[PDB]
Amino acid sequence: NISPGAEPLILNLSSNIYSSDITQQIEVMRWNFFEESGIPLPKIIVNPVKNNDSAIEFLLYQESIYKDTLIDDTVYFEAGHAEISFEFVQEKLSTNSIVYKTNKTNQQLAHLTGMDVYATTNDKITFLLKKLVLSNAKEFIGVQETRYLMDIMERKYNELVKELQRQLGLSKIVDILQRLVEENVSIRDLRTIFETLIFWSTKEKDVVILCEYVRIALRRHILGRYSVSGTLLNVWLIGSDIENELRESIRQTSSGSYLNISPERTEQIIGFLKNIMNPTGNGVILTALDIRRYVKKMIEGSFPSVPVLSFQEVGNNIELKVLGTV
């Protein structure tokens, strides 16, 4: 018979690479993703393909998102605040995500240096899967999933849900939760989010503004991720001249808001930042609340995966180390 709709996630593995234990390991990855992101992923379907070409493929709503061949001669790795190590190879995984590859001979030096390394087939598969999902997180949270987070969360917190439903429309709650996952903020702490929306729902009606109040209320989550050992934050600044120019350039229409700036000046502004920033990263850009969403959307696509915060979200209690200013 006919199924409800396109299957959400399918993994095709050549039978050379396939194994009977990967299903259980994948079911374990779903929990780690939910506890860190607070996004409940659907059930993953894994199909063995009766070919021995060592190929793999990931399908999102039955469209191919990634296809490649696994080899034993190489190994994938991840590095934190640690220093750069020789012979690394960067490869793009999506328009907004990149992974690091190396020859297996380099394995122990990275492991000894403190880097995390993935070498077995099940590691490589699980690593690629989690990075591909994080890149498409906005696709997994919509009307039917929002309603599921509210059906749970009413077996306890029952009055909090009733009050929220009376103050905001369900279609508005969906837009707020989507803007948070778009920038990797975690939505695990729902009562902080719902309590903050109930309080401001009567005073403000702009969905783009409510988003920033929810971000300020999540201070402990944001600082606990980007700061080092909770005591210091590395920073780059935009400066009063560019901030003033950008603040004045704002425009709006029924479709939304945008900036009236030329492509040349935009590329120049980006070029200044590109020249000042070190390729090692490990830093953040601070800005005023009025321009933050536009500065992020402007920089997006050039040296992506760099966080942009604000002087209100970041508190006065922490220490700031400045590494440059545009």
Which residues of this chain interact with a second copy, rule CB under 8 A? 2, 4-6, 34, 40, 60-65, 95, 142-144, 147, 152-153, 155-160, 163, 170-171, 188-192, 195, 198-199, 203, 220-221, 224, 230, 254-255, 317
- Name the minimum Å distance from CB 104 to a second copy: 28
79 and 47 in contact (C-beta within 8 Å)? no
- Name the minimum Å distance from CB 120 to a second copy: 26
Minimum CB distance to a second copy smaller for 192 or for 249: 192
Minimum CB distance to a second copy smaller for 88 or for 200: 200
- Name the minimum Å distance from CB 230 to a second copy: 8
Minimum CB distance to a second copy smaller for 271 or for 315: 315
In our burial notation (b when 16+ CB lie closer than 10 A, e otherwise), range 186-219 reads bbeebeebbbbbeeebeeeeeeeebbbbbbebbe
Minimum CB distance to a second copy smaller for 74 or for 186: 186
- Name the minimum Å distance from CB 86 to a second copy: 30
Q: Which residues pair with residue 285 across a beta bridge? A: 236, 308
Distance of CA 133 to the CA centre of its chain: 9
Minimum CB distance to a second copy smaller for 2 or for 112: 2
From first CA to last CA, the distance across the chain in angstroms is 60
Minimum CB distance to a second copy smaller for 40 or for 48: 40
List the helix and strand counts (H, then E) for the chain.
Answer: 12, 14
185 and 218 in contact (C-beta within 8 Å)? yes
* Neighbour tally for 103: CB within 10 Å: 11
24 and 18 in contact (C-beta within 8 Å)? no
- Name the minimum Å distance from CB 169 to a second copy: 10
- Name the minimum Å distance from CB 64 to a second copy: 7
